[PDB]
Amino acid sequence: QCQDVVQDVPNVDVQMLELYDRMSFKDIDGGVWKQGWNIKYDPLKYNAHHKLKVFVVPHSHNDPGWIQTFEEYYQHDTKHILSNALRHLHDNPEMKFIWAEISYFARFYHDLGENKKLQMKSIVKNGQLEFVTGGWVMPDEANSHWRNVLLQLTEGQTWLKQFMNVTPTASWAIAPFGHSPTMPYILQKSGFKNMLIQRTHYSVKKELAQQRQLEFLWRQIWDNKGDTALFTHMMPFYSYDIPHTCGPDPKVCCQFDFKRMGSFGLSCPWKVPPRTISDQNVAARSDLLVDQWKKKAELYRTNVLLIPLGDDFRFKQNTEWDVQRVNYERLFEHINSQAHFNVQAQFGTLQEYFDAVHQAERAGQAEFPTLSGDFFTYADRSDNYWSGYYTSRPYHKRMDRVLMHYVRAAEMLSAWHSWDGMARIEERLEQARRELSLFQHHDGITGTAKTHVVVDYEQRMQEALKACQMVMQQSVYRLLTKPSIYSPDFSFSYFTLDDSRWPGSGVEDSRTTIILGEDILPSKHVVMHNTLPHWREQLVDFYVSSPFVSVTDLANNPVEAQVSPVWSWHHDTLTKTIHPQGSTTKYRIIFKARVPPMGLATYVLTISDSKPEHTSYASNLLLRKNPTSLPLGQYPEDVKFGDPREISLRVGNGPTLAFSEQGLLKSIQLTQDSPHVPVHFKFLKYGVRSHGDRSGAYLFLPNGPASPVELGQPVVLVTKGKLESSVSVGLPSVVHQTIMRGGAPEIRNLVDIGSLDNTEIVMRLETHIDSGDIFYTDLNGLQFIKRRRLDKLPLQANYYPIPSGMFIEDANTRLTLLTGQPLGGSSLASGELEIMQDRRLASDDERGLGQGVLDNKPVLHIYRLVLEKVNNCVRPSKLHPAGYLTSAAHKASQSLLDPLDKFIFAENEWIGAQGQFGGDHPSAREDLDVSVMRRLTKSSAKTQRVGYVLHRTNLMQCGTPEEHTQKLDVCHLLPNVARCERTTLTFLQNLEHLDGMVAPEVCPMETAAYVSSHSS
Ligand SMILES: CO[C@@H]1O[C@H](CO[C@H]2O[C@H](CO[C@H]3O[C@H](CO)[C@@H](O)[C@H](O)[C@@H]3O)[C@@H](O)[C@H](O)[C@@H]2O)[C@@H](O)[C@H](O[C@H]2O[C@H](CO)[C@@H](O)[C@H](O)[C@@H]2O[C@@H]2O[C@H](CO)[C@@H](O)[C@H](O)[C@H]2NC(C)=O)[C@@H]1O
Ligand SMILES: [Zn+2]
């Protein structure tokens, strides 16, 4: 009974795209609630039989890196907050506290002595200290991939289950810069019942508050039935700090932040300090505070009110615990004893609030509206839209994607076996998962941390990449060596990884050359891994020390190969040009690897004395005035030269691409016969305002539409081969490359913004597609959501996250741009797509970072560009809020995010080598993925357990006849299965014991987790 995710438009009370269309966005002065109105209430609403029940929820926002590193904050702040929370909660049984960031809690609790560990477990068990969400971090929701949101959630909740014996079912997300429906998607499939959000556009807060729609059942945009719905509370005011959480008037609420009276170095900007509560003022102070509470309660439907009490790195000093607790206790004693207030107020936790709300709902006091959509792009005031962090620090945004994939591949490759503890597999994988998880923080992948904190994140992720490489190569050596020969040294490097696209050429000269020669080594084994659960072919390239190399498979069948030069681009400070130079001793060999589902395939590279029969050589043409020679050592084809001119290329049966004389795409012809469809790449620059608010790491505040980059007469390099052709051009700040391998082209930009201050570089595509004001962008790599460009909003409000792809279409034609990294983008006119490449900003943007963005470094951004005819596709109706990829665009996204992995055998001879692993793995239908495969038990467990997360996307149906494929039952991928269970996505709760030990496949747009148990 799968739900149809295409043809049924859900009926919801609030659909955010519709709301955006019909809503005004005027920024009017609301009074003391600057972005609201003067709230009025009827005092007679609450009375003896209907009291307002107020939960004051103490909290402390602890960033795992931002202006200090994780460890710096831990030593200077968080270890003291947690130590003093333990003490003060222990000593004050009615006090409560909620905690979100498990990275810090795990760091603290492991350093506690046993007596204090037991004390901590007691205040958790008795409900005083409550974990909210329980992720390793409170992640960004814009740039993060859903796989990594799940990874970090699982890392924190697995720790909490093991050590605290609790699993949160309420989420707390007070700080990400805008909010995504991927979160309720994952949380509802992970046992959650409630979630809270805060950072939404001030106009949205006003609109929803006017309708009492700040609490809603948030379902996915395609979900007609509502089974994805998760109850969500949106906070109504500008901040999560105490001045903006007691009620609408911050001048009043600041007087109830008792850390602000002076000795703590804090004050109230509204110039009225807090006063210590005493018997002689408690009636007056109570009157003021209850009036704020009753105004806040007017914005919600039940008689249960949430009052967060906290701020960043609060509840540190013992004196701060005392000043907040004793003054609130005095207020509660007075309020609760004076019947005319008709209030019962107490410290509470987040789960206590939600339980009481749903008790009111069950009592028939409220029904809640249904909502679908997202909450991007956030603006906290005026025109200050937070679309800059969709691009800031793009090197690390790209690195997140790379590490995402190597964590998946390392956990999958090593899951096939149990490993002795001496192999350190679990240690290395825990490290890798935790450093990637930490980077999902809303100051990590967002690019909003101080320079030295970004360096810490990068160093952590490099150690995680090294850890993944170690696990992967030990696993390949085990999976492909004859078992009676296998003799591992768990510290040795049997293989090294070769990655063509990270850090990427012009980024790092990291790539090892395979050194062959008659007097040293005639041949070398290489192995490709395919983490996807279907057979896959992909071209792979390696560097080799001779152009005379041929490829075989380990049945010694020849494999067709192409050798090309190794070209690198140089900014020549003497000629003031950007031009390529070729190596005269290293060459690139390219061939198609064919790899089993979730498997491995071995090939052999062999040198010979002359051109091998099954190896061809690319031609090379350098277009520039005033050329000079380009010798290439032993490469058998001389480079050709010419003046800049338009050129066209076609690889295989694929599209024909035409290029301008500046080396930029101008048109795509899909078929021999079909038209040249205009598709024009252009690079432009945005600047910064010379008056008013400045762009910085968070905010994008351009000084008008983008201006074209002046290109001069750039040098263009055309490489034409049977298997791979490309056009590369050295533009100012970007070496731009279009690569052809017979299908949709690959685009690579090596982006070096240099010392161009106050500049944002954008890549735009111009077409004739009649898209109007509509375009589609993805959310967290999970779903594509319809966007409408609104001219009532400024340019920066029409920018959205592009975490993995975007497209425009009309009745007949679609252009989809898939990315290998999250960046910001838009469609600012009909027929256009654009995506920001990097941004260098001299000023701070007044959101707390205290610096601009002047730490840029070269980054290789990767893309696929898919032009398609879509007039025969069955698409959603015009009212539906979602869009869906085609098969080719989905495969192109997978080619960027989860390419084949390439391993080079490190020693001269691999004794016992095998040619393949996984040839009998099922090759599953193209829309299904094994997103996670993770062994959950160490080797001493009698019953081994392996967890799998399956995800099925939804691809549009455009008339291509379906292949028979094989069903994938993950529970029988390993032998001796004894039990198969469906679980929450974190693997922490069993939901169903499955018949026959068979894990069913999932429906389109669904994600399920299974755990197989094996006797061992
Ligand atoms: C010191 O200058 C003030 O800085 C404020 C930002 O610092 C405060 O918040 C940070 C937030 O840290 C979290 O959020 C960041 C992203 O911002 C994130 O990266 C972190 O992970 C973390 O989660 C916090 O660390 C720090 O302790 C501090 O609390 C900023 O909000 C202030 O702007 C207000 O005040 C300005 C005058 O001082 C004023 O010009 C601004 O317009 C803005 O005024 C507010 O405007 C709204 C809407 O009109 C009103 O409703 C508010 O009442 C009003 N507030 C005030 C005080 O007037 C400021 O820049
Ligand atoms: Zn934060």
Side-chain angles (χ1 to χ4, degrees), residues 2-1016:
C2 295
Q3 282 201 98
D4 191 324
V5 306
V6 176
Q7 302 190 93
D8 299 317
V9 177
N11 184 6
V12 290
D13 299 302
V14 178
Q15 206 303 302
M16 290 302 299
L17 186 71
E18 186 275 344
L19 182 60
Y20 257 50
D21 199 32
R22 91 176 131 78
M23 220 185 0
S24 139
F25 298 94
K26 302 298 200 168
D27 181 23
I28 46 218
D29 184 352
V32 293
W33 180 15
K34 284 262 155 266
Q35 298 161 316
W37 73 92
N38 286 337
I39 299 165
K40 299 162 70 173
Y41 58 91
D42 177 357
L44 303 176
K45 183 173 190 168
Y46 297 105
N47 52 57
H49 318 288
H50 186 74
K51 300 176 53 177
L52 180 60
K53 301 168 186 33
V54 179
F55 286 103
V56 175
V57 179
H59 69 96
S60 180
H61 182 72
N62 284 243
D63 285 308
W66 179 33
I67 303 318
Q68 307 181 39
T69 64
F70 178 90
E71 185 67 14
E72 285 169 344
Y73 277 136
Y74 175 72
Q75 289 301 329
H76 301 157
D77 290 283
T78 304
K79 76 182 183 172
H80 303 292
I81 293 165
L82 286 173
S83 184
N84 288 340
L86 174 53
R87 164 205 187 155
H88 282 275
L89 293 172
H90 173 85
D91 286 349
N92 295 276
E94 304 286 329
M95 184 57 182
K96 307 268 184 158
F97 193 51
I98 57 169
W99 192 264
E101 301 91 0
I102 302 311
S103 56
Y104 279 124
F105 195 91
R107 169 102 178 65
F108 181 72
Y109 178 89
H110 279 309
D111 276 12
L112 291 172
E114 201 61 12
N115 141 293
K116 293 298 194 357
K117 290 184 168 66
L118 285 175
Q119 287 193 352
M120 180 70 80
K121 289 185 237 172
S122 190
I123 60 168
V124 170
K125 190 169 189 81
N126 81 357
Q128 279 186 268
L129 171 50
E130 182 181 288
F131 295 103
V132 292
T133 310
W136 206 239
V137 300
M138 175 185 299
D140 180 34
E141 303 181 17
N143 298 296
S144 57
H145 196 286
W146 76 267
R147 290 157 54 186
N148 294 334
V149 174
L150 176 61
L151 183 76
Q152 65 82 30
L153 180 62
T154 301
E155 192 69 27
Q157 289 210 333
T158 298
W159 188 96
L160 283 174
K161 179 157 183 215
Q162 182 170 0
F163 296 101
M164 288 290 98
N165 194 27
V166 293
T167 299
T169 61
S171 182
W172 175 258
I174 53 164
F177 323 140
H179 294 276
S180 176
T182 293
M183 304 302 293
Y185 180 91
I186 293 172
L187 294 171
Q188 189 273 334
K189 289 171 166 44
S190 303
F192 281 73
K193 297 305 185 173
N194 295 282
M195 60 177 299
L196 174 146
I197 64 176
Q198 156 58 21
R199 284 193 147 128
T200 66
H201 191 299
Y202 59 93
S203 296
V204 168
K205 290 167 174 266
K206 182 182 189 182
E207 185 69 46
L208 295 180
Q210 287 180 328
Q211 308 298 326
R212 301 181 315 154
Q213 291 171 331
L214 290 165
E215 284 174 325
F216 48 87
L217 290 162
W218 194 357
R219 67 169 71 178
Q220 300 304 303
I221 56 186
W222 68 81
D223 174 12
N224 184 54
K225 189 153 144 41
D227 288 352
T228 66
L230 189 65
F231 185 83
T232 298
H233 173 104
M234 181 188 302
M235 295 169 53
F237 299 137
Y238 165 78
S239 171
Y240 58 72
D241 69 5
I242 293 168
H244 297 92
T245 45
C246 99
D249 187 352
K251 175 178 283 77
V252 176
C253 295
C254 197
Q255 301 172 53
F256 293 91
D257 180 355
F258 295 93
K259 207 183 178 168
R260 294 186 184 241
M261 309 182 269
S263 70
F264 294 97
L266 300 173
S267 57
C268 282
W270 306 269
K271 300 185 201 290
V272 183
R275 291 190 247 137
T276 294
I277 307 307
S278 67
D279 287 343
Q280 96 175 25
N281 73 16
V282 66
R285 296 272 85 191
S286 289
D287 210 44
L288 257 189
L289 182 59
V290 171
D291 175 71
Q292 287 302 299
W293 286 352
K294 284 181 175 174
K295 284 168 177 166
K296 195 182 189 188
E298 268 315 287
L299 304 187
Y300 294 95
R301 291 183 186 209
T302 76
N303 66 335
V304 181
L305 186 63
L306 179 60
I307 302 295
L309 184 77
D311 203 341
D312 288 6
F313 293 101
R314 291 297 193 92
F315 292 101
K316 181 185 174 179
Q317 296 95 336
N318 293 308
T319 49
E320 177 186 359
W321 280 91
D322 283 337
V323 82
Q324 297 290 30
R325 180 177 57 77
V326 172
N327 281 296
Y328 273 92
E329 283 178 5
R330 290 176 191 135
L331 291 159
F332 296 155
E333 180 188 358
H334 181 82
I335 295 166
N336 294 346
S337 66
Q338 293 284 312
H340 66 87
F341 287 125
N342 298 296
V343 168
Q344 174 63 29
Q346 55 204 67
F347 293 124
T349 68
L350 183 65
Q351 184 68 41
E352 284 191 276
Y353 168 74
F354 283 123
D355 287 346
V357 167
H358 291 301
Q359 283 153 13
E361 178 190 21
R362 286 193 303 274
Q365 56 151 283
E367 47 204 282
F368 292 111
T370 59
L371 182 148
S372 75
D374 73 345
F375 298 103
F376 298 114
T377 288
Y378 174 56
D380 52 346
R381 56 187 171 92
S382 61
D383 65 349
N384 288 196
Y385 285 85
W386 296 43
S387 45
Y389 81 98
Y390 303 159
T391 300
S392 296
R393 279 61 177 265
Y395 182 91
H396 306 87
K397 284 170 156 65
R398 171 65 185 145
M399 193 174 190
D400 174 81
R401 289 320 194 245
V402 173
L403 181 57
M404 178 184 71
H405 167 75
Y406 280 123
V407 166
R408 169 177 167 164
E411 293 200 286
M412 177 175 294
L413 273 164
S414 67
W416 295 108
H417 292 99
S418 272
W419 293 82
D420 190 90
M422 290 282 293
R424 299 174 72 186
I425 297 306
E426 290 84 358
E427 177 192 348
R428 267 58 186 274
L429 291 176
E430 178 157 271
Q431 174 185 31
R433 285 194 304 271
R434 285 171 175 195
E435 300 298 21
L436 178 56
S437 289
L438 184 73
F439 194 60
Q440 304 312 302
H441 172 50
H442 60 269
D443 302 300
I445 190 174
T446 62
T448 57
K450 279 193 171 299
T451 297
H452 81 286
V453 180
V454 174
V455 165
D456 190 59
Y457 288 137
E458 185 178 332
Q459 292 175 335
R460 286 170 175 269
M461 288 197 278
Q462 185 55 32
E463 289 312 302
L465 285 168
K466 284 174 2 169
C468 291
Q469 176 176 235
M470 172 56 75
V471 170
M472 289 169 71
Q473 64 90 15
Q474 290 279 336
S475 298
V476 171
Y477 191 62
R478 191 171 178 181
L479 286 162
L480 288 176
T481 299
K482 185 174 189 163
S484 62
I485 293 179
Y486 175 66
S487 190
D489 170 352
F490 296 129
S491 76
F492 190 77
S493 305
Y494 292 101
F495 301 85
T496 56
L497 277 169
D498 181 59
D499 192 320
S500 303
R501 295 189 304 197
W502 176 262
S505 311
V507 102
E508 199 121 70
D509 189 314
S510 41
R511 285 186 78 186
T512 99
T513 300
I514 297 175
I515 294 173
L516 301 179
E518 165 175 349
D519 297 293
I520 183 155
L521 185 60
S523 70
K524 178 55 74 191
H525 285 63
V526 296
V527 174
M528 266 55 61
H529 175 239
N530 170 30
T531 195
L532 304 178
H534 51 259
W535 282 90
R536 183 156 55 145
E537 294 179 321
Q538 184 209 283
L539 293 191
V540 290
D541 71 302
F542 292 89
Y543 285 3
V544 284
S545 64
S546 167
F548 304 132
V549 176
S550 58
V551 181
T552 49
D553 68 19
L554 233 68
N556 203 39
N557 318 314
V559 179
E560 184 168 345
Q562 171 184 319
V563 170
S564 297
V566 170
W567 290 112
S568 61
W569 290 78
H570 299 279
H571 171 69
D572 185 332
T573 50
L574 277 296
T575 64
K576 307 286 179 168
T577 58
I578 307 168
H579 62 93
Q581 297 284 102
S583 177
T584 63
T585 52
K586 289 167 61 173
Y587 306 93
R588 264 179 84 231
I589 188 159
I590 312 134
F591 64 92
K592 189 175 40 190
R594 181 171 175 267
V595 189
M598 298 166 60
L600 300 163
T602 305
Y603 292 81
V604 178
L605 304 195
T606 301
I607 194 171
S608 61
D609 276 309
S610 57
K611 289 196 221 134
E613 174 177 355
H614 298 289
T615 297
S616 69
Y617 295 91
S619 60
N620 299 270
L621 170 67
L622 212 249
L623 299 174
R624 59 129 81 200
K625 279 159 187 271
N626 194 47
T628 50
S629 63
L630 288 165
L632 288 180
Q634 298 170 70
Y635 191 83
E637 162 97 0
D638 294 340
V639 178
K640 281 61 202 357
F641 304 91
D643 287 352
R645 64 168 189 263
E646 297 202 331
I647 53 154
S648 163
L649 287 170
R650 191 189 178 177
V651 173
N653 285 355
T656 300
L657 300 203
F659 299 83
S660 73
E661 78 167 60
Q662 306 117 81
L664 294 139
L665 188 65
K666 65 176 348 188
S667 69
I668 300 174
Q669 183 189 50
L670 295 177
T671 70
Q672 261 291 11
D673 59 60
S674 68
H676 302 274
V677 176
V679 179
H680 286 253
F681 267 125
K682 185 177 291 174
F683 289 87
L684 306 100
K685 26 184 80 187
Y686 291 99
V688 173
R689 296 170 188 182
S690 56
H691 66 279
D693 296 328
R694 307 285 205 264
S695 300
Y698 305 85
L699 302 188
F700 178 34
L701 287 160
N703 59 334
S707 299
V709 177
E710 298 272 301
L711 303 186
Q713 308 167 241
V715 178
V716 180
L717 173 64
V718 183
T719 298
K720 176 173 174 311
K722 184 141 140 29
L723 300 185
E724 181 189 82
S725 295
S726 60
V727 176
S728 299
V729 57
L731 305 176
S733 307
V734 184
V735 180
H736 172 70
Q737 307 181 278
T738 305
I739 306 165
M740 294 176 70
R741 294 177 179 100
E746 180 177 339
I747 314 302
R748 300 187 185 169
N749 290 337
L750 181 58
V751 182
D752 181 4
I753 196 167
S755 63
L756 294 177
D757 275 26
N758 294 321
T759 296
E760 316 205 22
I761 302 176
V762 68
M763 180 176 65
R764 178 178 299 159
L765 283 154
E766 300 172 336
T767 75
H768 288 168
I769 292 169
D770 191 15
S771 57
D773 54 8
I774 300 303
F775 58 107
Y776 294 78
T777 66
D778 74 307
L779 289 161
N780 316 92
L782 181 63
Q783 62 183 278
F784 281 78
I785 186 165
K786 190 177 185 174
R787 305 304 195 177
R788 177 181 290 108
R789 185 197 86 241
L790 293 172
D791 298 332
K792 66 191 172 184
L793 297 187
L795 187 164
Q796 65 270 17
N798 288 300
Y799 255 62
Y800 289 96
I802 318 296
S804 79
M806 66 193 305
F807 61 88
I808 49 169
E809 65 181 0
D810 62 21
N812 294 316
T813 310
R814 181 188 281 193
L815 188 67
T816 305
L817 179 73
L818 298 311
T819 70
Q821 58 286 319
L823 295 167
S826 189
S827 171
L828 293 177
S830 185
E832 294 185 359
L833 293 169
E834 74 179 57
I835 184 153
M836 203 70 79
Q837 301 304 288
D838 198 1
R839 60 210 300 270
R840 181 175 176 88
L841 303 154
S843 305
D844 178 67
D845 51 359
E846 310 220 346
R847 297 306 191 281
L849 170 57
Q851 57 167 87
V853 178
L854 298 170
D855 57 359
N856 314 78
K857 55 203 264 164
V859 52
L860 183 74
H861 287 327
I862 63 173
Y863 311 86
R864 295 289 298 282
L865 184 63
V866 185
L867 175 73
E868 294 170 300
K869 296 328 277 175
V870 290
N871 53 297
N872 291 133
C873 298
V874 176
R875 284 177 287 186
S877 98
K878 284 219 145 221
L879 299 185
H880 198 289
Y884 297 98
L885 294 189
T886 60
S887 168
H890 177 244
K891 280 190 181 287
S893 176
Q894 293 183 310
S895 82
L896 298 173
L897 295 181
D898 291 281
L900 300 182
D901 311 295
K902 297 177 296 167
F903 298 86
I904 301 167
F905 190 70
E907 296 264 47
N908 289 341
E909 191 171 2
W910 182 7
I911 296 195
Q914 298 178 302
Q916 190 186 253
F917 167 71
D920 56 353
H921 294 168
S923 191
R925 196 163 124 210
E926 59 173 331
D927 52 358
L928 193 62
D929 196 14
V930 176
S931 307
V932 173
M933 173 177 185
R934 178 180 301 130
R935 186 175 291 254
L936 300 175
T937 42
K938 289 184 164 139
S939 63
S940 68
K942 205 173 172 307
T943 298
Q944 288 295 309
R945 298 170 73 236
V946 181
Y948 302 88
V949 173
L950 300 191
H951 175 69
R952 196 193 302 265
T953 192
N954 182 74
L955 301 177
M956 291 203 304
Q957 293 257 13
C958 305
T960 314
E962 184 179 5
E963 300 241 326
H964 307 273
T965 50
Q966 304 166 273
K967 295 295 94 67
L968 171 66
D969 170 14
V970 292
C971 277
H972 275 88
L973 276 171
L974 282 167
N976 311 126
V977 64
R979 189 178 188 79
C980 181
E981 297 158 308
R982 191 169 61 85
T983 64
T984 47
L985 295 187
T986 56
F987 304 125
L988 293 178
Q989 178 187 2
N990 300 326
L991 295 174
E992 172 180 357
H993 178 209
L994 295 166
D995 286 352
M997 305 183 241
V998 174
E1001 299 183 345
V1002 299
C1003 292
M1005 303 302 294
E1006 296 293 352
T1007 306
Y1010 300 104
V1011 172
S1012 58
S1013 300
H1014 307 266
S1015 158
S1016 75

